[PDB]
Design a protein around this ligand. Structure first.
Ligand SMILES: Cc1cc2nc3c(=O)[nH]c(=O)nc-3n(C[C@H](O)[C@H](O)[C@H](O)COP(=O)(O)OP(=O)(O)OC[C@H]3O[C@@H](n4cnc5c(N)ncnc54)[C@H](O)[C@@H]3O)c2cc1C
Ligand SMILES: Cc1cc2nc3c(=O)[nH]c(=O)nc-3n(C[C@H](O)[C@H](O)[C@H](O)COP(=O)(O)OP(=O)(O)OC[C@H]3O[C@@H](n4cnc5c(N)ncnc54)[C@H](O)[C@@H]3O)c2cc1C
Ligand SMILES: CC(=O)c1ccc[n+]([C@@H]2O[C@@H](COP(=O)([O-])OP(=O)(O)OC[C@@H]3O[C@@H](n4cnc5c(N)ncnc54)[C@H](OP(=O)(O)O)[C@@H]3O)[C@@H](O)[C@H]2O)c1
Ligand SMILES: CC(=O)c1ccc[n+]([C@@H]2O[C@@H](COP(=O)([O-])OP(=O)(O)OC[C@@H]3O[C@@H](n4cnc5c(N)ncnc54)[C@H](OP(=O)(O)O)[C@@H]3O)[C@@H](O)[C@H]2O)c1
Lengths: 446, 446
């Protein structure tokens, strides 16, 4: 009786469970499933917590999400092909929902699927070891409800623990004497903490854009963004400027490669994350920077040194929810014997060709399109519903232009669903004025 | 060739190395020693970092220490019996040195001992397993310098990883709505971050007393302390009050079991720590609250279910540095065969009698005196130099009275060394006015 361990109940682990349940619903015999989740509820990043650093059990706090976060790209680019926004909400809604709204949506699918029963919440995965003599994995966990550590044997293991939770936090000279708060983006919670302050944001990617936008929207006095290689380059509001990189700090001031200098109240390092798996030894352990094509993953999913071990969602993410689906459906089919694996040599050659293409990429359009091609290849192999990928790529193109037009109003635009054709209505309140982030305020009138 | 693993190079792991080195200096053959330390330098808590949450490798940040921290008790109560303050500094100093000064002192002893060579820095212990078949331990670590995970075999393991680093962080109704910073004492770094703010401190023990004192000294507008059981009782300054526990928080305000309420800018949970050992399964893992006599430790040191495993410094700490010495010398002597262990039944009965006495303790004096008795029993069994414990107890008595007299000036008093007899002079600057926490300002004549 074959047995599967799924590590994590975020979007990826939820998709993995959904994938199996869907095969079962069609009448197939499926493996026994156990899913381990260290948090008290599913949803992963989208499960908000006020906690910071270490959680109530002493495990690293997982979510990096903050008050007032809304979708960074069109919801239409992340809609599940087997569970639409229309089905879930019963009505059209706008295109960039707040966190709690997206959280409600991803949970809706697995509530309907009835797969909560497979999950052991409040349980941290400590160790995964492969045993050569038995060809099984031993998974060791800590159940923080009973405060006991136990282990169990599995035939296959699917790792869904994310890669945007363990921060990359570089040091700058003087940090030990600066008098204001220093935090990583991962620790950022309520933008109101910085009302009427001067905030320095170190970095120039999605985290800097959006955390600065929150500080702006909720009333920071002044924002400074500094970049290591090139500026974000958007037209920012009046109280926000982009400088070349921080070089040092003193008691109160930041100094930049500019020769400029000024007083700053708080420093937020928006400097990204590391791939970190403390429960894996080197035989199973993925080591990569954040990118579209990590190596050693056949079809981006199958660990090439031991193809009884799988990874979901370890790539950088233009696409997200329906990419995890495409991967989870594929992992499922491999595990079930529907898609036999080629030799290790063929895997290696295939992965090298995908890496060669990855190194070629220059524009944003080339990047999301490459990821669409990856997804296309996955959904063609499986009964996951095909959806219109070139039309999703075109939605990304529109979104890109909207950001360039005006970085503060991109969230005020609407797109059509590629699953239903339903056009998103305009939201009742422009983003800059929509201060309440609750699901109730978003879905109600006003 | 017998082999020992020492887990941690704070004061306890340094003492364990010092104990073995001292035996060797006297002419004995010692085992091979390997010490693993996840930080880049030794000193444990006393090694200051600006970092918070997770460290540069993604390991939990260890030190809970903050800017401007000074010794909480007389230095005379923590003086090494084999390496005096007079030897280290070459002159008298006042009785409550700043963190950097005490760090320099603890490093001084192990610099002189030459024990740096046994330590692998930037290396995090992941797992310790005991193999019944070989009667050895397998220690698996991650070397963050080479990003390599490897394991090695040991005959004995001494755990020195501390118990004041994994926070106990209780949740209060409304924390997910509150607009200012919420942090644990463990994340507290520079008190200047709170200058001109209203700060609520949840708790009523050493962390609350001292973090409040720092916020006060460096210019917080207003301080509130709230207690769960009973108030700290000291006479606080004008802008600081104590009241019954927090019950809930909204967007801007804290509400107390009082019926009282007010606007607060930051909340600091001074609610203590948990014993947390993510690298130990239940066969080896100590489970206890913070107290003078944890169970399952023969002489407070030998793990009773597997007496080839040892714990140093897991008790609550009135005494500290020379308690770790007493423990480390004892662990050393059992490892080397100088002090054969009694049967498991005898160990149990001994530990029970120590626990029975512990539950008897009511006053502060009874508590440090019991810990003095514990230490006496250890140093009598070993060649650690005897020192005057009743005279150390009388120094605690004076310190207690000084705190009762005035909680803001207790650090301005001086005591005599029980090791050398020499009186500590008065510091050049009253604590409230000594804003500079550097070693250089402290040791200078002005
Ligand atoms: C700040 C931020 C904003 C984002 N915004 C968007 C957005 O607007 N749109 C979008 O499409 N994507 C966004 N993302 C991307 C995000 O990666 C995905 O949307 C999605 O959350 C990834 O799903 P996942 O399940 O792979 O990983 P995660 O959501 O990270 O979930 C991993 C799960 O693994 C669990 N886990 C980890 N370690 C252990 C362990 N040792 N034991 C047991 N359980 C463990 C965690 O508790 C968590 O539940 C954002 C990410 C961040 C960090
Ligand atoms: C805020 C605060 C203030 C204090 N003030 C005083 C004071 O004024 N006077 C006093 O006498 N005592 C004070 N203490 C008490 C403190 O417990 C002791 O002084 C002393 O530091 C205990 O030493 P230790 O080596 O047992 O533990 P620690 O100092 O905590 O050191 C443990 C070592 O283990 C390492 N480690 C942990 N986990 C791993 C791992 N998995 N792998 C590898 N290495 C690991 C850590 O990096 C660390 O170096 C204070 C404690 C705190 C928290
Ligand atoms: C479709 C869409 O909306 C989309 C597409 C992709 C990703 N995402 C989102 O983006 C992700 C989140 O993205 P992220 O911004 O958290 O992290 P990254 O993007 O990896 O880069 C931060 C990096 O930080 C900077 N940095 C690193 N070290 C630095 C240093 N020493 N000094 C100054 N800056 C430093 C880097 O600059 P440099 O390396 O010099 O440029 C780079 O800007 C996820 O949340 C995902 O959801 C969304
Ligand atoms: C000789 C000497 O100087 C000495 C002696 C011992 C310790 N220390 C130092 O003190 C240590 C550090 O001591 P610490 O204050 O960090 O931790 P503890 O003392 O364990 O208690 C915090 C606890 O927090 C309170 N608390 C817990 N949950 C609460 C809740 N839900 N609401 C309100 N309050 C709550 C407890 O109240 P309650 O439980 O209700 O009282 C108690 O006050 C170390 O730094 C050590 O160096 C020094």
């Amino acid at each position: 009786a074959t047995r599967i361990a799924i590590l994590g109940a975020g979007p990826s682990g939820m998709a993995q469970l959904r994938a199996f349940q869907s095969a079962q619903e069609k009448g197939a015999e499926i493996p026994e499933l156990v899913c381990f989740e260290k948090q008290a509820d599913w949803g992963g990043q989208w499960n908000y917590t006020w906690r910071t650093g270490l959680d109530e059990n002493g495990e690293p706090v997982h979510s990096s999400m903050y008050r007032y976060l809304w979708s960074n790209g069109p919801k239409e680019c992340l809609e599940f092909a087997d569970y639409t926004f229309d089905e879930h909400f019963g009505k059209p809604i706008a295109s960039y929902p707040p966190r709690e709204v997206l959280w409600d949506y991803i949970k809706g699918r697995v509530e309907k699927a009835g797969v909560r029963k497979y999950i052991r919440f409040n349980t941290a995965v400590r160790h995964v070891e492969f045993n050569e003599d038995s060809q099984t994995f031993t998974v060791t966990v800590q159940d923080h409800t009973t405060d006991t550590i136990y282990s169990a044997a599995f035939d296959y293991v699917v790792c869904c623990t994310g890669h945007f939770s363990t921060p990359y936090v570089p040091e700058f000279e003087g940090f030990e004497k600066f008098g204001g708060r220093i935090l990583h983006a991962h620790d950022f919670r309520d933008a109101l903490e910085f009302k009427d302050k001067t905030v320095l944001l170190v970095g120039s990617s999605y985290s800097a854009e959006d955390i600065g936008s929150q500080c702006y929207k909720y009333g920071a006095k002044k924002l400074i963004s500094c970049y290591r290689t090139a500026p974000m380059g958007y037209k920012w509001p009046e109280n926000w400027d982009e400088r070349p990189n921080l070089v040092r700090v003193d008691t109160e001031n930041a100094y930049f490669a500019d020769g400029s200098s000024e007083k700053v109240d708080a420093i937020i390092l928006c400097t990204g994350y590391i791939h970190h798996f403390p429960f894996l030894n080197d035989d199973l352990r993925l080591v990569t920077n954040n990118r579209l094509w990590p190596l050693n993953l056949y079809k981006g999913v199958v660990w090439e040194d031991n193809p009884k071990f799988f990874y979901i969602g370890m790539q950088d993410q233009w696409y997200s929810f329906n990419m995890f689906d495409a991967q989870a459906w594929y992992a499922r089919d491999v595990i079930m014997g529907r898609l036999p694996l080629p030799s290790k040599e063929e895997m290696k050659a295939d992965s090298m060709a995908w890496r060669e293409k990855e190194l070629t990429l220059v524009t944003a359009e080339e990047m999301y399109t490459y990821q669409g091609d990856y997804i296309q290849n996955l959904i063609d192999m499986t009964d996951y519903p095909s959806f219109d990928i070139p039309a999703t790529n075109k939605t990304f193109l529109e979104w890109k232009h909207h950001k360039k037009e005006n970085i503060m109003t991109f969230r005020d635009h609407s797109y059509r669903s590629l699953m239903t054709g339903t056009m998103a209505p305009k939201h009742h309140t422009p983003w800059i004025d929509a201060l309440d982030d609750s699901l109730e305020a978003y879905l109600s009138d006003k």
